[PDB]
Structures are given as C-alpha cells and as structure tokens.
Design a protein around this motif. Structure first.
Motif, PDB file in Angstrom:
ATOM      1  N   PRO A 122     -62.014  15.011  -0.441  1.00 36.11           N
ATOM      2  CA  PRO A 122     -62.501  15.466  -1.758  1.00 36.11           C
ATOM      3  C   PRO A 122     -61.998  14.647  -2.941  1.00 36.11           C
ATOM      4  O   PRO A 122     -62.550  14.791  -4.040  1.00 36.11           O
ATOM      5  CB  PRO A 122     -61.995  16.914  -1.836  1.00 36.11           C
ATOM      6  CG  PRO A 122     -60.775  16.940  -0.923  1.00 36.11           C
ATOM      7  CD  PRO A 122     -61.107  15.985   0.201  1.00 36.11           C
ATOM      8  N   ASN A 123     -60.983  13.804  -2.766  1.00 35.77           N
ATOM      9  CA  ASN A 123     -60.450  13.004  -3.860  1.00 35.77           C
ATOM     10  C   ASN A 123     -60.960  11.570  -3.865  1.00 35.77           C
ATOM     11  O   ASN A 123     -60.584  10.797  -4.752  1.00 35.77           O
ATOM     12  CB  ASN A 123     -58.920  12.997  -3.797  1.00 35.77           C
ATOM     13  CG  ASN A 123     -58.343  14.382  -3.575  1.00 35.77           C
ATOM     14  OD1 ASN A 123     -57.424  14.565  -2.775  1.00 35.77           O
ATOM     15  ND2 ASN A 123     -58.890  15.367  -4.274  1.00 35.77           N
ATOM     16  N   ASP A 124     -61.805  11.191  -2.908  1.00 39.45           N
ATOM     17  CA  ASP A 124     -62.303   9.823  -2.812  1.00 39.45           C
ATOM     18  C   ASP A 124     -63.568   9.695  -3.657  1.00 39.45           C
ATOM     19  O   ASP A 124     -64.626  10.220  -3.290  1.00 39.45           O
ATOM     20  CB  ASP A 124     -62.574   9.455  -1.353  1.00 39.45           C
ATOM     21  CG  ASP A 124     -62.926   7.978  -1.176  1.00 39.45           C
ATOM     22  OD1 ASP A 124     -63.625   7.413  -2.036  1.00 39.45           O
ATOM     23  OD2 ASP A 124     -62.482   7.373  -0.178  1.00 39.45           O
ATOM     24  N   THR A 125     -63.463   8.981  -4.781  1.00 34.23           N
ATOM     25  CA  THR A 125     -64.602   8.884  -5.684  1.00 34.23           C
ATOM     26  C   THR A 125     -65.674   7.941  -5.144  1.00 34.23           C
ATOM     27  O   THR A 125     -66.862   8.182  -5.361  1.00 34.23           O
ATOM     28  CB  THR A 125     -64.149   8.435  -7.079  1.00 34.23           C
ATOM     29  OG1 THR A 125     -63.478   7.174  -6.990  1.00 34.23           O
ATOM     30  CG2 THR A 125     -63.213   9.463  -7.694  1.00 34.23           C
ATOM     31  N   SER A 126     -65.290   6.869  -4.440  1.00 33.39           N
ATOM     32  CA  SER A 126     -66.304   5.987  -3.864  1.00 33.39           C
ATOM     33  C   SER A 126     -67.162   6.727  -2.848  1.00 33.39           C
ATOM     34  O   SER A 126     -68.360   6.446  -2.721  1.00 33.39           O
ATOM     35  CB  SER A 126     -65.663   4.761  -3.210  1.00 33.39           C
ATOM     36  OG  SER A 126     -64.991   5.103  -2.009  1.00 33.39           O
ATOM     37  N   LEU A 127     -66.579   7.670  -2.111  1.00 33.88           N
ATOM     38  CA  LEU A 127     -67.389   8.460  -1.185  1.00 33.88           C
ATOM     39  C   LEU A 127     -68.392   9.318  -1.943  1.00 33.88           C
ATOM     40  O   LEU A 127     -69.549   9.451  -1.525  1.00 33.88           O
ATOM     41  CB  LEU A 127     -66.490   9.326  -0.297  1.00 33.88           C
ATOM     42  CG  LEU A 127     -65.823   8.588   0.864  1.00 33.88           C
ATOM     43  CD1 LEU A 127     -65.028   9.511   1.737  1.00 33.88           C
ATOM     44  CD2 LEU A 127     -66.916   7.871   1.686  1.00 33.88           C
ATOM     45  N   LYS A 128     -67.968   9.901  -3.067  1.00 32.84           N
ATOM     46  CA  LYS A 128     -68.879  10.685  -3.892  1.00 32.84           C
ATOM     47  C   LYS A 128     -70.016   9.817  -4.426  1.00 32.84           C
ATOM     48  O   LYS A 128     -71.192  10.206  -4.360  1.00 32.84           O
ATOM     49  CB  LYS A 128     -68.101  11.336  -5.039  1.00 32.84           C
ATOM     50  CG  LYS A 128     -68.632  12.702  -5.456  1.00 32.84           C
ATOM     51  CD  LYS A 128     -67.776  13.846  -4.888  1.00 32.84           C
ATOM     52  CE  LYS A 128     -66.515  14.090  -5.726  1.00 32.84           C
ATOM     53  NZ  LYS A 128     -65.332  14.494  -4.911  1.00 32.84           N
ATOM     54  N   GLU A 149     -72.441  13.084 -12.337  1.00 28.19           N
ATOM     55  CA  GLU A 149     -71.759  13.812 -13.399  1.00 28.19           C
ATOM     56  C   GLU A 149     -70.336  14.180 -12.974  1.00 28.19           C
ATOM     57  O   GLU A 149     -69.385  13.966 -13.735  1.00 28.19           O
ATOM     58  CB  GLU A 149     -72.616  15.019 -13.807  1.00 28.19           C
ATOM     59  CG  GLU A 149     -73.741  14.533 -14.774  1.00 28.19           C
ATOM     60  CD  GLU A 149     -74.941  15.446 -14.932  1.00 28.19           C
ATOM     61  OE1 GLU A 149     -75.054  16.446 -14.202  1.00 28.19           O
ATOM     62  OE2 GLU A 149     -75.785  15.139 -15.804  1.00 28.19           O
ATOM     63  N   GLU A 150     -70.159  14.644 -11.735  1.00 34.81           N
ATOM     64  CA  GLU A 150     -68.819  14.982 -11.252  1.00 34.81           C
ATOM     65  C   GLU A 150     -67.912  13.749 -11.216  1.00 34.81           C
ATOM     66  O   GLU A 150     -66.756  13.782 -11.685  1.00 34.81           O
ATOM     67  CB  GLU A 150     -68.927  15.639  -9.877  1.00 34.81           C
ATOM     68  CG  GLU A 150     -67.613  15.859  -9.184  1.00 34.81           C
ATOM     69  CD  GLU A 150     -67.712  16.879  -8.070  1.00 34.81           C
ATOM     70  OE1 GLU A 150     -66.654  17.365  -7.622  1.00 34.81           O
ATOM     71  OE2 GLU A 150     -68.843  17.203  -7.647  1.00 34.81           O
ATOM     72  N   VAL A 151     -68.425  12.637 -10.684  1.00 31.01           N
ATOM     73  CA  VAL A 151     -67.618  11.418 -10.654  1.00 31.01           C
ATOM     74  C   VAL A 151     -67.146  11.072 -12.062  1.00 31.01           C
ATOM     75  O   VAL A 151     -65.953  10.839 -12.298  1.00 31.01           O
ATOM     76  CB  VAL A 151     -68.393  10.249 -10.023  1.00 31.01           C
ATOM     77  CG1 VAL A 151     -67.603   8.955 -10.189  1.00 31.01           C
ATOM     78  CG2 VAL A 151     -68.670  10.525  -8.558  1.00 31.01           C
ATOM     79  N   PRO A 156     -64.238   8.756 -15.850  1.00 29.15           N
ATOM     80  CA  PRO A 156     -65.325   8.420 -16.787  1.00 29.15           C
ATOM     81  C   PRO A 156     -65.555   6.933 -16.931  1.00 29.15           C
ATOM     82  O   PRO A 156     -66.581   6.533 -17.492  1.00 29.15           O
ATOM     83  CB  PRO A 156     -64.857   9.037 -18.120  1.00 29.15           C
ATOM     84  CG  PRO A 156     -63.684   9.934 -17.778  1.00 29.15           C
ATOM     85  CD  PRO A 156     -63.073   9.356 -16.530  1.00 29.15           C
ATOM     86  N   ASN A 157     -64.633   6.102 -16.455  1.00 34.95           N
ATOM     87  CA  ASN A 157     -64.771   4.657 -16.547  1.00 34.95           C
ATOM     88  C   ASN A 157     -65.369   4.032 -15.295  1.00 34.95           C
ATOM     89  O   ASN A 157     -65.384   2.802 -15.184  1.00 34.95           O
ATOM     90  CB  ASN A 157     -63.409   4.013 -16.816  1.00 34.95           C
ATOM     91  CG  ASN A 157     -63.047   3.998 -18.286  1.00 34.95           C
ATOM     92  OD1 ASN A 157     -63.788   4.506 -19.126  1.00 34.95           O
ATOM     93  ND2 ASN A 157     -61.893   3.415 -18.602  1.00 34.95           N
ATOM     94  N   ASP A 158     -65.819   4.837 -14.337  1.00 34.54           N
ATOM     95  CA  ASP A 158     -66.332   4.288 -13.081  1.00 34.54           C
ATOM     96  C   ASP A 158     -67.665   3.600 -13.338  1.00 34.54           C
ATOM     97  O   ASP A 158     -68.651   4.260 -13.654  1.00 34.54           O
ATOM     98  CB  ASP A 158     -66.483   5.388 -12.032  1.00 34.54           C
ATOM     99  CG  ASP A 158     -66.758   4.831 -10.629  1.00 34.54           C
ATOM    100  OD1 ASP A 158     -67.880   4.347 -10.351  1.00 34.54           O
ATOM    101  OD2 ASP A 158     -65.827   4.857  -9.805  1.00 34.54           O
ATOM    102  N   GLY A 159     -67.712   2.279 -13.173  1.00 31.56           N
ATOM    103  CA  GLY A 159     -68.927   1.547 -13.497  1.00 31.56           C
ATOM    104  C   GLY A 159     -70.088   1.844 -12.560  1.00 31.56           C
ATOM    105  O   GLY A 159     -71.240   1.932 -12.996  1.00 31.56           O
ATOM    106  N   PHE A 160     -69.809   1.994 -11.259  1.00 33.40           N
ATOM    107  CA  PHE A 160     -70.876   2.304 -10.303  1.00 33.40           C
ATOM    108  C   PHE A 160     -71.562   3.614 -10.679  1.00 33.40           C
ATOM    109  O   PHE A 160     -72.800   3.703 -10.728  1.00 33.40           O
ATOM    110  CB  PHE A 160     -70.285   2.377  -8.888  1.00 33.40           C
ATOM    111  CG  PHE A 160     -71.312   2.619  -7.798  1.00 33.40           C
ATOM    112  CD1 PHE A 160     -71.856   3.877  -7.616  1.00 33.40           C
ATOM    113  CD2 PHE A 160     -71.699   1.600  -6.938  1.00 33.40           C
ATOM    114  CE1 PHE A 160     -72.782   4.114  -6.610  1.00 33.40           C
ATOM    115  CE2 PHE A 160     -72.625   1.840  -5.926  1.00 33.40           C
ATOM    116  CZ  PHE A 160     -73.158   3.101  -5.767  1.00 33.40           C
TER     117      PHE A 160
END
Lengths: 429, 20
Positions: A122-128, A149-151, A156-160
């Motif tokens: 649940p903490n892996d943002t790339s998986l999300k 939106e959750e990512v 908030p700086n995640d470019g993907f």
C-alpha cells in the motif's frame, strides 16, 4: 540489491545460481530443465519457481506463443502462491505477470494483478501509478482518475502521476485545468513522462485556450523524437513515408479510385441524402471532442477494414462500388464514411492518429460559400463531384459558416509507399 | 479503451495488442 531468497532458498543458493546462469546464457532448453529439477526437488522454493517462470516467459518469447506465456503467467502466479515469498520477489513476479498479460493483450487480467499488488504494497506509489495505467488500458477513466488523485495527494510532485492526471483531464474536456499537470509532469523528467502522448495533448490544450505557448511544446516533443515534425504529430507512425499536407491523385497513385468516385459521385450523393431523409439516426455525432461548436455527424460504411452490414444496406450501390478498391476497404487504419457538417461548426485544429493513411474527401453537397478546410498552412475548399486528398496526420482545421448543410464522402486509403506485408500486419486503428 | 481513434488521437492507446 533485490532480496529474492527466503530462508530455505539461501540453503540451495548454489543450485539456484547454477540454473540462473543457464538461463542468462540463452540455453532456455537447459534452464527450463534445471529449474524444473529444482521445482520438483524443492516444490516450495519461490526462487526456483521464479526461475521456471522466467524461462517460460523466455520460451513464449522464442516460440511466440500465447499458451506458453499463459503458462508463464500462471507460474508467476504460482511464485506468489508459494509460502514465505520475499517481498522484492513477490513484487517482481506479479509486476511481470501484469506486464506480460498486457503485452499479450489481456488487459482485464493485468488489472486484476495490479489491484492485488496495491493491496500487498500500500505504500508503493509506482505500483499505484501502474494500476492507473491498467484502468486507462481498459477504458475506465473514472477509476484511473481516482488512482492518480490518490498518488498526487501523497506525492504531489510525482511527474508520472502529473502527466497521467493531465491526460485524463484533457480527455474529459477540462482543457485549462489539464495544462499545468501535463506541463509540470513533462517538466519533472520522471520515468514515463517523456511520452509523445503528453506533448501532443499539452499543445492541443493550449491551442484550444488560445495560449500561444503551444508550438513551443510541439517543438520540444519533436526535439525528443516523439513527432515526425512540428506540423505532423501523429503517434502510430511508420517512419520513412512521404510527408506533405496536401496530395494530388497522381502523387498518391490511386488514380482509378479517384476516377470511380468522381464519375459516380451522384449515386454516392443520392444514397447519402436518402439516409439523411429516411434513416438520419444512422448518422452519429462526432465523438472525439474535436469540435469547438456546431453540428457534425458521420455515417460509417467501413471501419478498421470491416464492412458495416446494416449501414451498407442503406447505401448498397455505394458499398458495391467501393468493394472493388481494397486499398480503401482493407485500410484497417481508416474509415469509409459520409460526413455531414452544418453551419455554425468549427472543428478545432486536430491531428489523426497514424501516418499510415491518406484521407480522400469527395464533395457531394457543397454550399457556394462558408465551408473550408485547412491542412498545415493551406486552406482549401471542396467541390461537388471532386476529390481532395490530404494527410490528416498533419494539423487540420475545418469551418462551416454556410446557410445549409455540407455533405462529403470520406474514403481513407493506405499510404501508397506502405508495402503489402505492412498492410496485412499493421495493427488496426 | 473501448473507444476508437477515428478522426483523432484522444484515447490512451489506439490499438489492441495480442501477440509477438
């Protein structure tokens, strides 16, 4: 350093390594057999199972087999179904399962695996982010939107996530809102943001809002190799095809099709008018968000090289005529369709998806004034009974300000430099 | 994507994949 060995696997590391080397040397025969021996010998080993799966994945590579890859997909599954699987190995195995399902075209299956991965980590943002891609690939833009939106709410700086959010906004007609996300995500330079898909739509959003910044980004997208040129921004291309906004019949080589369309234009016209009069519901509104305003509908006889049987019951002579020209009836990256556009219509500047077709327009009912079409830097007018030919992979724009409707017949053809093999093999669009 | 790229390029992907 990925931690792929659980407590038991550490005790058989020598056998595991020996087998992995046989795979890394391309001896998929021997590697499959060695990892098979290790799975029999150690039926609970995750790393042995992952080796079997990787070799099955490679075997589906060599023989290019859906049954083979389906087996590998279950074996990656099996890895996850064994006891005491290290987290890094669990993630690798399931991620590759999802990816190979997608590579095969099993987008629904991929989605299932991705949901599982997010539950497990649940903490892996790339998986999300990856899950959002799965939703996009099945056409579920609502769920994709929530995922990103959750990512962003966490990172908030995640470019993907920025570019993909902006893509979804743009597709929903939230043009202005879409711009900062596409721009910031591209500007992040993060992995997966250098994608022509986001340059294309960032520029297009800017144009729609009258922000002159648009071509700046077009140039950048062409600098990074995504577009054939600033003016030709299609993304499903075959490089090496002659590129010009406007074509003559001679230049295209389809002189016989042009002749048939022009010699028989009144029959084509009359069948379209009859459908307008008695079966107007067969004309469907344009549905790709290309209009600024106005009414524009199309009655399709062929799409992706497949005849629409009901539609051709309504224009039977036209379909019979066209059947003699496989260059269009077999253009699996084009359509054959009537197109009616009414006064008060403005089609935003727009680009088709592929450089693999050229678009013919036969004038059927053309008001004396008010109708025009720009391709690249040139604006032209239609003529009743005459064919115009343009490469709709170049930016093009249309206006309808007459006092009555404008009816044309649209006949897409394979780009003439495309070879027979390519015409049989290119995926349909 | 359950919609098709006909006149434009609005879908996330415009093709369906199936094999090698």
């Amino acid at each position: 350093k990925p931690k792929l060995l659980n407590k038991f696997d550490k005790t058989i590391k020598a056998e595991l390594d020996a087998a992995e080397k046989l795979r890394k040397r391309g001896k998929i025969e021997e590697a499959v057999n060695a990892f098979k021996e290790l799975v029999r010998k150690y039926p609970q080993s995750p790393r042995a199972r992952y080796g079997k799966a990787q070799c099955e994945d490679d075997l589906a590579e060599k023989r290019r087999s859906n049954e083979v890859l389906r087996g590998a997909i279950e074996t990656y599954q099996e890895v996850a179904s064994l006891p005491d699987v290290p987290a890094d190995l669990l993630k690798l195995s399931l991620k590759r399962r999802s990816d190979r399902q997608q590579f095969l075209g099993h987008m629904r299956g991929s989605l299932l695996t991705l949901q599982r991965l997010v539950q497990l980590f649940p903490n892996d943002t790339s998986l999300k982010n990856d899950l959002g891609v799965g939703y996009l690939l099945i056409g579920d833009n609502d769920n994709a939107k929530k995922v990103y939106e959750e990512v962003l709410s966490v990172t908030p700086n995640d470019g993907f996530a920025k570019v993909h959010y902006g893509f979804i906004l743009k597709a929903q007609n939230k043009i202005a809102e879409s711009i900062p996300y596409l721009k910031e995500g591209i500007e992040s330079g993060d992995p997966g943001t250098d994608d022509g898909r986001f340059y294309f739509h960032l520029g297009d959003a800017m144009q729609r809002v009258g922000n002159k910044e648009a071509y700046k980004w077009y140039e950048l997208g062409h600098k990074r190799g995504h577009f054939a040129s600033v003016w030709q921004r299609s993304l499903y291309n075959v490089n090496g095809l002659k590129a010009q906004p406007w074509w003559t019949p001679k230049e295209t080589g389809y002189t016989e099709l042009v002749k048939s369309l022009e010699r028989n234009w009144k029959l084509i016209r009359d069948e379209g008018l009859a459908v307008m009069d008695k079966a107007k519901g067969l004309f469907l509104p344009e549905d790709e968000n290309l209009r600024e305003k106005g009414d524009w509908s199309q009655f399709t006889l062929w799409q992706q090289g497949r005849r629409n049987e009901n539609a051709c019951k309504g224009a039977p002579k036209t379909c019979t005529l066209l059947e003699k020209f496989p260059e269009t009836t077999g253009c699996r990256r084009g359509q054959i369709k009537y197109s009616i556009m009414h006064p008060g219509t403005h089609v935003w500047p727009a680009t088709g998806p592929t450089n693999c077709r050229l678009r013919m327009h036969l004038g059927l009912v053309i008001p004396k004034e008010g109708c025009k079409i720009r391709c690249a830097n040139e604006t032209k007018t239609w003529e009743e009974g005459k064919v115009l030919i343009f490469d709709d992979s170049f930016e093009h724009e249309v206006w309808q300000d007459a006092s009555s409707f404008r009816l044309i017949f649209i006949v897409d053809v394979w780009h003439p430099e495309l070879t027979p093999q390519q015409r049989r093999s290119l995926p349909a669009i | 994507n359950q919609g098709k790229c006909k006149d434009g390029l609005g879908e996330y992907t415009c093709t369906s994949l199936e094999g090698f």
